[PDB]
Every structure is written in structure tokens, then in C-alpha cells.
Structure 1
Amino acid sequence: IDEALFDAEEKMEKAVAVARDDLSTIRTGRANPGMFSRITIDYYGAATPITQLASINVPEARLVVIKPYEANQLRAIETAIRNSDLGVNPTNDGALIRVAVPQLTEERRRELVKQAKHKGEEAKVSVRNIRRKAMEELHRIRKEGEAGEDEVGRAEKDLDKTTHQYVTQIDELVKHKE
């Protein structure tokens, strides 16, 4: 019962965290390091984020400079960005990567508000699915006699309580992306 609850609050935590990233990889607003965090480049057989492999430097609002902490991960990172979802054709000079935002337009931005709202929805669907796997556990606890209806019923209500908190936590994360 208690470990079921603990295992869930824990898993929703990770969903909210993955959410902040999804929503970060979107700039309703203007250029910043956060957008580059969802991108990953095979690092020694492990999918690693560039936001830890390089310094995302933002001079202008339409210009980002990327110095990979290691020279040899440069092309690797550079390619991860033209292949990403930002819509950029990163440049290279041997050490640095020159990225040109674009500035955006009245319409695409709207198509990114729809997007941010839509990926916050995926994340609330993931949460409710965590909440549901936990239910089938609390349900299976009660049925095995590892706990009385009384104790498990309480957990059900506590399970639901927590879900809303993590859901509202995703709500007031897409709120900022308006």
C-alpha cells in the first residue's frame, strides 16, 4: 500500500520533470538554452543531452553559440540540432556551432501554443496511467488480503489526491507557455 503510493508519487515526479523539458523545447517567446535540452547525441552508446555536453550561449534573440565541452562531440551535436524539431541549420567552424533561430511568425507561434498544450496533455495522460497502474496494485492488494478495504480505500483517495497535484503542476507549466 505505502510502497505503491511511494512508487507512484515518484513516477509522477518524473513525468512532470519530463514535461518541463518537452515544454522547454518550445520557445513561445524567444531563444534560450532550455530549448536544446530535449535533443540528444549518442554519447559512448548512451543517449546524452547536449545541455550537459556543451555551453549554449545566447548573444542575440536570434543567435545561439554552442561550444561543445569536447571538440570530438561537435559534429555529433551539430547534427543532432539540424535533425531536431527546432527548425535550424546549425553551422560549424571547428570549435563553435552557429545557430540561427528565425524570429518566428504570426501563425507558427500559434501552432506552438497548440503544441505546448498538446504535449502537456500527453504528460497528463502518462500521469493518469501511472495512477492507474497503481490502482490495479491497490486493487490487487485488497483482493489478496494484504490489507482490508478500509486501509486500501484510504490509499485510493490518497492516490487520486496526489494525481491532481502533479496534473495541476503540468497545468501551471503549460499556463506559462501561452
Structure 2
Amino acid sequence: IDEALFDAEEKMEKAVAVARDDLSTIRTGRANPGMFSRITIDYYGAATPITQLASINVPEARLVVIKPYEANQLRAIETAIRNSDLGVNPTNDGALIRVAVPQLTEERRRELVKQAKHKGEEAKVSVRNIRRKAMEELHRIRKEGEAGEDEVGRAEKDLDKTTHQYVTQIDELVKHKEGELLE
């Protein structure tokens, strides 16, 4: 009864952490390491993100220079960024990669808004399933009489409040990203 509830809340908090991460990978004006973390290369038969194979210094708000842990790899990485949906032009001074992040085209903004909204919807749906799982658990507990009708009743109101609070937090992260996209 407490397990179903305390473990649900913790799952929710975790889904909100994941959502936050996922949303930060969204490309935007003001470059950041976040957008590169989803681009990855064939590193000896398995894949591996550019973010475990290189260091990502961000000089200007609209420039990013990268320093691969291994100098021969420098090229495969440059290829990766050139392939991304990020719509960016890579370059290299032989040991490092220069990447100037063009201004978002207006059409591309609305595009990425839709993406951010979708990630929210995804994370909110999963919070709701976490809740349904524990809610079905309390319903079980009430049927088999392993706690009083008043106990469970209280725990159902508490879960509902907790769920609402985390769904609301995900809408926040969305609205913030969407505002960040439109200036």
C-alpha cells in the first residue's frame, strides 16, 4: 500500500528526469552538447554516441568545436554530424571539428515545436500508466481486505494528486522548450 505508492512516485520522478533529458536533445538557437548526444558512430562493430568519444566545448552561443579522444576517428565523427537532421555544416583544423550552427529557419522552428510536444505526450502517457498500475494495485488491496477502506481511499487521493503534479511538471518542461524555440 505504501510500496505501491512510494514506488509509483519514484517512477514518476524518473520519467520526468527522462523527459527533461529527451527535451534537451532538441536542437535550438543557442547550441549545446545535448543535441549531439543522439548522433552516434560505428565504433568497432557496435554503435557509440559522439558524447563518449569526444569532448564538446561550446564557444559562442552559435558555435561548437569538438575534440575527439582519438585523432583518426575525427573523420567518422564529422561524417556523423553532416548526416544528422541538425542541418549543420562541419569542418576540421586537422585535430578538431568546427561546427557553425545556422539560424533556425522559421519552418524548422514549428517543426521542432511539434517534436517537443510529442515527447511530452509520450512521457505524460507513461506517467498515467505508472499510476494505473499502482491504482490497480490498491484496488486489489481493497478487494482482498489487506487494508481498511479508509486507508485505501486516502492513498488513492494521494496518488491522484501526485500524478497530476508530475504531468503538470512535464507540461512545464514543454512550454519552456517551446518558448525557447520561438524567442
TM over 0.5: yes
1:161–1:87 CA distance, 2 compared to 1 (3 A): same
1:25-80 deviation digits (Å, cap 9, x = unpaired): 11343211222334456889998654455322122344312224455875675565
Alpha-carbon separation, structure 2, partners of 1:15 and 1:8: 11
Farther-moved stretch of structure 1 (59-68 vs 107-116): 59-68
Deviation at residue 122 of structure 1 after TM alignment: 1.1
Alpha-carbon separation, structure 1, partners of 2:13 and 2:44: 28
1:57–1:131 CA distance, 2 compared to 1 (3 A): same
1:11-32 deviation digits (Å, cap 9, x = unpaired): 1111111111221111343211
Alpha-carbon separation, structure 2, partners of 1:80 and 1:143: 56
Alpha-carbon separation, structure 1, partners of 2:87 and 2:34: 15
1:123-157 deviation digits (Å, cap 9, x = unpaired): 11111111111111112222222212221121111
1:59–1:44 CA distance, 2 compared to 1 (3 A): same
Alpha-carbon separation, structure 2, partners of 1:45 and 1:14: 31
Deviation at residue 10 of structure 1 after TM alignment: 0.9
2:61 corresponding residue in structure 1:
61
* Structure 2: unaligned runs, 5 residues or longer: 178-182
Farther-moved stretch of structure 1 (160-169 vs 45-54): 45-54
1:31 corresponding residue in structure 2:
31
Farther-moved stretch of structure 1 (95-104 vs 121-130): 95-104
2:49 corresponding residue in structure 1:
49
1:67–1:141 CA distance, 2 compared to 1 (3 A): farther
1:74-125 deviation digits (Å, cap 9, x = unpaired): 5675565455543346556664333342221112111112221221111111
1:163–1:142 CA distance, 2 compared to 1 (3 A): same
Alpha-carbon separation, structure 1, partners of 2:131 and 2:79: 38
Decide which structure has the larger Cα Rg and report it.
Answer: 2
1:133–1:83 CA distance, 2 compared to 1 (3 A): farther
Farther-moved stretch of structure 1 (13-22 vs 67-76): 67-76
1:9–1:40 CA distance, 2 compared to 1 (3 A): farther
TM-score normalized with structure 2 length: 0.77
1:42–1:134 CA distance, 2 compared to 1 (3 A): farther
Does the CA-based 8 Å contact 1:21-1:37 persist in structure 2?
no
1:81–1:142 CA distance, 2 compared to 1 (3 A): farther
TM-score normalized with structure 1 length: 0.79
Does the CA-based 8 Å contact 1:67-1:97 persist in structure 2?
yes
Q: SS state of the match for residue 150, structure 1?
A: helix
